[PDB]
């Protein structure tokens, strides 16, 4: 039995121009390839095939392998693999939230499509139909929790956000928070954390939204409360510690919040509290009052009645209908893998992911637990961070913060196999999501017009093939113009977003396209095409 291979996995994703394909043999001298129907071509064991090149984005590569043995047996293996195109995407800050990092982009977002939530009643009760794919104010992805960048911590529940949603009316905030759990797909092996004990309902661990009400206040998550006795204690954290001492860490924060919503995933904590950052530091900064705090605690978890008009519900399902990580075993992650488009990123329910699979909280915040109205909130807006923990320090954020990935690979103290990122000390420095309104000094980062630009068949067609040059615009303003050029001649300079190039002789092409939109911004691309 001979047959042609390859060591590439199959519907491999890749973002460059082009991915050098390895080819081998089993059995033959010789082999031949046909890439996108292309005329067979002879291959030795070592030749690499430009899989992509010449190519728009977002198209699939087909590669046939075709080997005779001495029996005169005829083998084919036919692969695909996914040449991908990503537009850059507008984003906003405003520097009077006290931000000192950009928001994360790529697959997360603040605000996307400038979303600050809608003027909508939510029943607080499990049922998605309430919510929509319109109404996400931070966009996160799955597979970024810190566990995954351990050697094999994929034994321990995720504690996986995915997205953020809000909405508001005259009574109350309301918040939709997914979190996702890939370990079935991931890491089957690890039963623990692909099953029922993986519902962060299993245990009382602390989460957060963290609320910027007036802008101008900066809370570091510093805590001051009186004792019985009149006299005045600090804690770092308002959470987490014991003796003014926070011995496995917490949450500060740089970006600035006034009010924080302490909640648990069991809605069991009877110290539930909505915090306010009434009280002067030294240093100008304001801290978090044990005295002042709002009860939001259940009297009994049997009854779920919780304090002052606070509503939480959570259940197993997903709303989003595309789930994107990186789909990667443990021990193949990168540092810094969840910011770079050279990572395997997929939609999970392309992967076998189900709704079942995921967790959602409902939450309702009265309005007059943060001193606010609707007026307000359409007319100044407030700022929104949900935070997860798996007991002290922050593990995910929506919108995300690289400071819950900074130590993700280092050893928790107490049991190596996990996470330092459970007990160590993060700092938020990313905006906020903003609800209702946009700061006063927002500066927004227009994403430049562009085009993803390219041949629908792979380099390597017979002389004679007819190729359709393809291009396709984004950030475009009014209608677009193309020229289309073969070795820097014009071959075609219309509205039409495609031209036939039937090139006569073997050689090496340049191929591109020059876009022009109706207020004469440019977008270029050029690319090589071999016969
Ligand atoms: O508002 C106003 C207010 O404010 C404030 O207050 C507040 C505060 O502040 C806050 O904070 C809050 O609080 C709250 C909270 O939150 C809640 O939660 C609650 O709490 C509480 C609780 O409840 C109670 O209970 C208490 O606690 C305590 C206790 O009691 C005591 O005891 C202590 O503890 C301790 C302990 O004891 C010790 O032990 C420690 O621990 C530790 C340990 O040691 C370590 O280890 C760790 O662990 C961990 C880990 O890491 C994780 O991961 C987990 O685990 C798990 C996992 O994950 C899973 O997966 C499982 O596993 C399993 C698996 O899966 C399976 O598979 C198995 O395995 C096995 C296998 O199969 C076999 O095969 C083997 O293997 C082997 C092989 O064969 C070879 O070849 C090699 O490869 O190797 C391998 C390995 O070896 O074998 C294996 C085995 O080994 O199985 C397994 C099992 O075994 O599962 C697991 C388990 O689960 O988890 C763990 C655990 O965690 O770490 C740890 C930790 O660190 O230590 C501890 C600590 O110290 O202590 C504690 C503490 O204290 O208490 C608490 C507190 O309190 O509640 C609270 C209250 O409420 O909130 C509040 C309010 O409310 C202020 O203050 C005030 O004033 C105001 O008013
Ligand atoms: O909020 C304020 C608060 O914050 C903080 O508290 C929080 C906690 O920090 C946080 O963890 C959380 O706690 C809750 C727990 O999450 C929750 O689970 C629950 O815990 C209960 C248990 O439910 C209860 O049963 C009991 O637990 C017992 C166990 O039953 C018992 O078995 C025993 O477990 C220990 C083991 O005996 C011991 O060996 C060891 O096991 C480790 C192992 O050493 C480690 O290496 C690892 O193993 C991995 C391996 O590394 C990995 O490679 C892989 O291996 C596979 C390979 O990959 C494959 O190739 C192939 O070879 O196969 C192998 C497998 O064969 O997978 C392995 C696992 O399969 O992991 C092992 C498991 O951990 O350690 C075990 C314990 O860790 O003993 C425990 C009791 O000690 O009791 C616990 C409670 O104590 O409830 C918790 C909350 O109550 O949330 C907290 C919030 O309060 C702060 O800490 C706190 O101070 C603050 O106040
Ligand atoms: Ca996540
Ligand atoms: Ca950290
Ligand atoms: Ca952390
Ligand atoms: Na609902």
């Given at each position: 039995?001979?047959?042609?291979?390859?060591?590439?996995?199959?519907?491999?994703?890749?973002?460059?121009?082009?991915?050098?394909?390895?080819?081998?043999?089993?059995?033959?001298?010789?082999?031949?390839?046909?890439?996108?129907?292309?005329?067979?071509?002879?291959?030795?064991?070592?030749?690499?095939?430009?899989?992509?090149?010449?190519?728009?984005?977002?198209?699939?590569?087909?590669?046939?392998?075709?080997?005779?043995?001495?029996?005169?047996?005829?083998?084919?293996?036919?692969?695909?693999?996914?040449?991908?195109?990503?537009?850059?995407?507008?984003?906003?800050?405003?520097?009077?939230?006290?931000?000192?990092?950009?928001?994360?982009?790529?697959?997360?977002?603040?605000n996307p499509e400038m979303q600050l939530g809608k003027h909508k009643t939510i029943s607080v009760?499990?049922?998605?139909?309430?919510?929509?794919?319109?109404?996400?104010?931070?966009?996160?992805?799955?597979?970024?929790?810190?566990?995954?960048?351990?050697?094999?911590?994929?034994?321990?529940?995720?504690?996986?956000?995915?997205?953020?949603?809000?909405?508001?009316?005259?009574?109350?905030?309301?918040?939709?928070?997914?979190?996702?759990?890939?370990?079935?797909?991931?890491?089957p092996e690890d039963n623990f954390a692909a099953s029922n004990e993986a519902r962060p309902w299993?245990?009382?661990?602390?989460?957060?939204?963290?609320?910027?009400?007036?802008?101008?206040?900066?809370?570091?998550?510093?805590?001051?409360?009186?004792?019985?006795?009149?006299?005045?204690?600090?804690?770092?954290?308002?959470?987490?510690?014991?003796?003014?001492?926070?011995?496995?860490?917490?949450?500060?924060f740089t970006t600035h919040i006034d009010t924080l919503v302490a909640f648990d995933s069991n809605?069991?904590?009877?110290?539930?509290?909505?915090?306010?950052?009434?009280?002067?530091?030294?240093?100008?900064?304001?801290?978090?009052?044990?005295?002042?705090?709002?009860?939001?605690?259940?009297?009994?978890?049997?009854?779920?009645?919780?304090?002052?008009?606070?509503?939480?519900?959570?259940?197993?399902?997903?709303?989003?209908?595309?789930?994107?990580?990186?789909?990667?075993?443990?021990?193949?992650?990168?540092?810094?893998?969840?910011?770079?488009?050279?990572?395997?990123?997929?939609?999970?329910?392309?992967?076998?992911?189900?709704?079942?699979?995921?967790?959602?909280?409902?939450?309702?915040?009265?309005?007059?637990?943060?001193?606010?109205?609707?007026?307000?909130?359409?007319?100044?807006?407030?700022?929104?961070?949900?935070?997860?923990?798996?007991?002290?320090?922050?593990?995910?954020?929506?919108?995300?913060?690289?400071?819950?990935?900074?130590?993700?690979?280092?050893?928790?103290?107490?049991?190596?196999?996990?996470?330092?990122?459970?007990?160590?000390?993060?700092?938020?420095?990313?905006?906020?999501?903003?609800?209702?309104?946009?700061?006063?000094?927002?500066?927004?980062?227009?994403?430049?017009?562009?085009?993803?630009?390219?041949?629908?068949?792979?380099?390597?067609?017979?002389?004679?093939?007819?190729?359709?040059?393809?291009?396709?615009?984004?950030?475009?303003?009014?209608?677009?113009?193309?020229?289309?050029?073969?070795?820097?001649?014009?071959?075609?300079?219309?509205?039409?977003?495609?031209?036939?190039?039937?090139?006569?002789?073997?050689?090496?092409?340049?191929?591109?396209?020059?876009?022009?939109?109706?207020?004469?911004?440019?977008?270029?691309?050029?690319?090589?095409?071999?016969?």
């Amino acid at each position: 039995h001979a047959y042609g291979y390859t060591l590439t996995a199959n519907n491999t994703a890749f973002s460059t121009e082009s991915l050098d394909v390895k080819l081998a043999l089993k059995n033959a001298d010789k082999g031949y390839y046909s890439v996108d129907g292309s005329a067979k071509k002879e291959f030795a064991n070592g030749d690499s095939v430009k899989v992509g090149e010449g190519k728009i984005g977002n198209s699939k590569v087909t590669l046939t392998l075709y080997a005779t043995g001495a029996d005169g047996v005829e083998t084919e293996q036919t692969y695909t693999f996914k040449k991908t195109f990503t537009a850059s995407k507008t984003t906003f800050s405003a520097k009077s939230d006290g931000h000192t990092t950009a928001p994360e982009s790529g697959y997360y977002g603040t605000n996307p499509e400038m979303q600050l939530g809608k003027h909508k009643t939510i029943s607080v009760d499990g049922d998605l139909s309430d919510w929509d794919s319109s109404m996400i104010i931070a966009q996160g992805v799955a597979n970024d929790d810190p566990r995954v960048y351990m050697p094999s911590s994929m034994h321990e529940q995720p504690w996986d956000a995915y997205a953020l949603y809000s909405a508001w009316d005259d009574d109350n905030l309301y918040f939709l928070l997914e979190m996702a759990n890939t370990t079935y797909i991931t890491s089957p092996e690890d039963n623990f954390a692909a099953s029922n004990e993986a519902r962060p309902w299993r245990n009382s661990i602390p989460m957060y939204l963290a609320l910027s009400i007036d802008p101008a206040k900066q809370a570091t998550g510093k805590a001051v409360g009186t004792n019985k006795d009149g006299s005045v204690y600090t804690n770092p954290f308002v959470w987490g510690c014991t003796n003014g001492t926070a011995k496995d860490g917490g949450t500060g924060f740089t970006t600035h919040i006034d009010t924080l919503v302490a909640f648990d995933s069991n809605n069991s904590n009877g110290g539930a509290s909505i915090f306010k950052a009434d009280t002067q530091d030294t240093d100008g900064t304001y801290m978090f009052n044990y005295d002042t705090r709002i009860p939001i605690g259940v009297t009994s978890f049997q009854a779920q009645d919780n304090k002052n008009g606070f509503k939480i519900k959570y259940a197993n399902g997903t709303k989003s209908t595309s789930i994107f990580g990186i789909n990667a075993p443990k021990g193949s992650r990168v540092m810094g893998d969840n910011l770079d488009m050279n990572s395997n990123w997929v939609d999970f329910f392309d992967e076998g992911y189900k709704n079942s699979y995921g967790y959602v909280y409902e939450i309702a915040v009265p309005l007059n637990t943060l001193g606010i109205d609707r007026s307000y909130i359409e007319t100044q807006g407030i700022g929104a961070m949900q935070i997860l923990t798996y007991g002290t320090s922050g593990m995910d954020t929506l919108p995300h913060d690289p400071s819950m990935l900074d130590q993700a690979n280092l050893e928790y103290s107490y049991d190596p196999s996990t996470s330092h990122e459970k007990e160590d000390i993060d700092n938020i420095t990313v905006p906020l999501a903003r609800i209702g309104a946009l700061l006063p000094d927002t500066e927004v980062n227009e994403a430049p017009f562009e085009v993803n630009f390219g041949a629908n068949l792979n380099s390597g067609q017979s002389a004679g093939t007819p190729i359709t040059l393809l291009a396709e615009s984004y950030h475009a303003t009014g209608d677009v113009t193309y020229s289309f050029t073969v070795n820097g001649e014009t071959v075609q300079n219309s509205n039409t977003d495609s031209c036939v190039w039937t090139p006569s002789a073997d050689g090496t092409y340049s191929i591109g396209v020059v876009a022009v939109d109706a207020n004469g911004n440019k977008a270029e691309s050029t690319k090589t095409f071999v016969v």
